[PDB]
Enzyme design. Structure first.
Site, PDB file in Angstrom:
ATOM      1  CD  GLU A   1      -2.986  -1.019  -0.039  1.00 28.92           C
ATOM      2  OE1 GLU A   1      -2.927  -0.186  -0.939  1.00 28.92           O
ATOM      3  OE2 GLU A   1      -3.894  -1.835   0.015  1.00 28.92           O
ATOM      4  CB  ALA A   2       4.075   2.123   1.482  1.00 26.58           C
TER       5      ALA A   2
END
Ligand SMILES: Nc1ncnc2c1ncn2[C@@H]1O[C@H](COP(=O)(O)O)[C@@H](O)[C@H]1O
Ligand SMILES: Nc1ncnc2c1ncn2[C@@H]1O[C@H](COP(=O)(O)O)[C@@H](O)[C@H]1O
Lengths: 258, 258
Positions: free
Chosen positions: A172-173
């Site tokens: 997700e980063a």
């Protein structure tokens, strides 16, 4: 396959930032950028030899695990810890066959019955993203849990909880400069805190945001997407322009218009 | 007031480009930019001392005229040719009073009964923009016509036609990088040709485009604007993004949102 290394031991905001820039650099070819946002490779027609990149994580306890990331969506697909490899339930024949090319040299290969999406993982973890801590210390811990799964050291709830931390701190980063910033703050001050509403709403709508941007009328969305601010206030996005400092990679949805 | 000089004698694409960059530089303060496009100063609260810039044009015949441009919209307001100044009909008291600060040192000052907008000017010119030639040679000629107006040398139809050429080659080229490109092509090949549909439709909708952009939902327009391509095909604009290489300056319509 490309492998990128990162250790939680002595991680700083710059070594973490370097790690996420390297993952984004492997996921993207540079060939397809729409409204300044890179689009990930389309799965139809991608050769198996360019389907995955590997991420090798080490922790202060000198233990390692290697996660396999799918390049068409940057999601974790399976992992290796010494003599064993574990893969989430493939949800189609094409992906069942593709994962056979991963960790071929390992002796024991297992495929879990459950897929890797958040809901299954929260049910099994007996807990929601809103309550699970993220930060360098949770990722340190996750590396150990994942590694001791092999030998009965980790029970399935800690396994699922460790999968949720890995996927938000890596996949997700990489999907979002915003969630990467969120993780850098946690490392700067060595804090660990559960994700607030803006994080969870971004994660939940990554796929819908990708489609809305790629189907847009010159940047203008036909229907607005409601996201949430840190304090939970809802807000509408009508245009790709405000998402440009927020989303870093999009899943392929359609071909770019003339 | 600031004065910018330009001569049609030996004009090249770079001396013309330099001239239009200098006019844009005087019109704008740098204080207000929305979606990468500079907004012109708001007329309510602007001091008279910063209301106009002057443009001094000379031609191969060694004749000069100085046009006064209004900084809130970059439109030609009046002009000086030796001993005389002529001003278009002010359409409000505020502007009637403002133009008294222009060319105060001239002996004869006249105000025409007609305003300077395109329709009046085409009626008086007995011709439309679609039929009037633009290029370095038409502007050369316009400088002479304007200058000989003083002494009965120019009849009102040639005066109006010369006003249409000046306003499209100065005010509209400053309003739009697109129309400036159009004029540079004419100078490069020393051509003169009437404006095609995309030019005239841009000129007609400059004010509406300024409002649509400033009232937009994050760049997304509530209602689309139909412009025209060179061959007359209509097309819709839904977003400010495609107008960014096309419009260079916008008239002030509202204050920028939080
Ligand atoms: N392999 C995976 N690992 C982690 N998260 C995933 C994975 N597959 C899907 N997700 C996410 O979990 C949620 C549900 O996934 P899905 O069931 O494929 O729509 C969405 O937010 C997905 O982005
Ligand atoms: N002083 C002026 N000189 C040249 N064009 C103008 C001037 N004032 C308005 N226009 C243009 O002429 C058309 C009609 O002007 P208006 O009557 O003020 O809307 C529009 O395209 C305006 O941009």
């Amino acid at each position: 396959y490309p492998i990128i290394n990162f250790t939680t031991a002595g991680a700083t905001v710059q070594s973490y930032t370097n790690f996420i820039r390297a993952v984004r650099g492997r996921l993207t070819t540079g060939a397809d950028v729409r409204h300044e946002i890179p689009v990930l490779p389309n799965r139809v027609g991608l050769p198996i030899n360019q389907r995955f990149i590997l991420v090798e994580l080490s922790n202060h306890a000198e233990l390692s695990v290697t996660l396999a990331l799918d390049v068409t969506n940057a999601y974790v697909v399976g992992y290796r810890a010494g003599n064993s490899a574990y893969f989430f339930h493939p949800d189609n024949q094409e992906d069942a066959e593709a994962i056979t090319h991963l960790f071929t040299d390992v002796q024991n290969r297992y495929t879990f019955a459950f897929g890797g999406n958040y809901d299954r993982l929260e049910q099994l973890a007996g807990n929601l993203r809103e309550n699970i801590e993220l930060g360098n210390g949770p990722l340190e811990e996750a590396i150990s849990a994942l590694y001791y799964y092999s030998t009965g050291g980790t029970q399935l709830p800690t396994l699922a909880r460790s999968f949720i931390i890995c996927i938000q701190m890596i996949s997700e980063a990489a999907h979002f400069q915003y969630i990467e910033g969120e993780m850098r703050t946690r490392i700067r001050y060595n804090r660990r805190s559960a994700p607030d509403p803006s994080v969870i709403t971004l994660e939940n709508s990554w796929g819908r945001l990708s489609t809305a941007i790629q189907e847009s009328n010159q940047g203008a969305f036909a229907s607005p997407i409601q996201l949430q601010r840190r304090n939970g206030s809802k807000f509408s996005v009508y245009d790709v322009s405000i998402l440009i400092p927020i989303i870093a990679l999009m899943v392929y949805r359609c071909a770019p218009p003339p």
